[PDB]
Design a protein around this ligand. Structure first.
Ligand SMILES: [Hg+2]
Length: 106
């Protein structure tokens, strides 16, 4: 219950929520792509490897998204997925569309 509520609060209180691990190039790449849209002010990155409940958090992320791996990326509570999903959305114009709908890019 407590772990789920904690994860939920991160997803619900930040428009852009990224769950990450320590020194992971795909975490770093995804976060850099998002900051390249000047999303810093509405982004929260949570390092779940530096957490005693990493496995619980990952299991819940898999319940929510189908995958336990990080990075795990949510935008306005919608599941984006991992860095590869973000790259696809970015290259194909979907990411910009999402952000436009949120007033985050003009
Ligand atoms: Hg990627």
């Amino acid at each position: 219950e407590a772990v789920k509520k904690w994860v939920n609060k991160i997803i619900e209180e930040n428009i852009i929520a990224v769950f990450a691990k320590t020194e992971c190039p795909y975490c770093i790449k995804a976060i850099s792509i998002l900051k390249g849209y000047n999303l810093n002010s509405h982004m929260h990155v949570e390092n779940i490897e530096k957490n005693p409940d990493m496995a619980n958090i990952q299991a819940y992320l898999k319940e929510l998204t189908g995958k336990s791996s990080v990075p795990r990326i949510f935008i306005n509570k919608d599941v984006v997925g991992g860095c590869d999903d973000l790259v696809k959305e970015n290259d194909e114009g979907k990411l910009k569309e999402r952000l436009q709908k949120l007033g985050l890019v003009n």
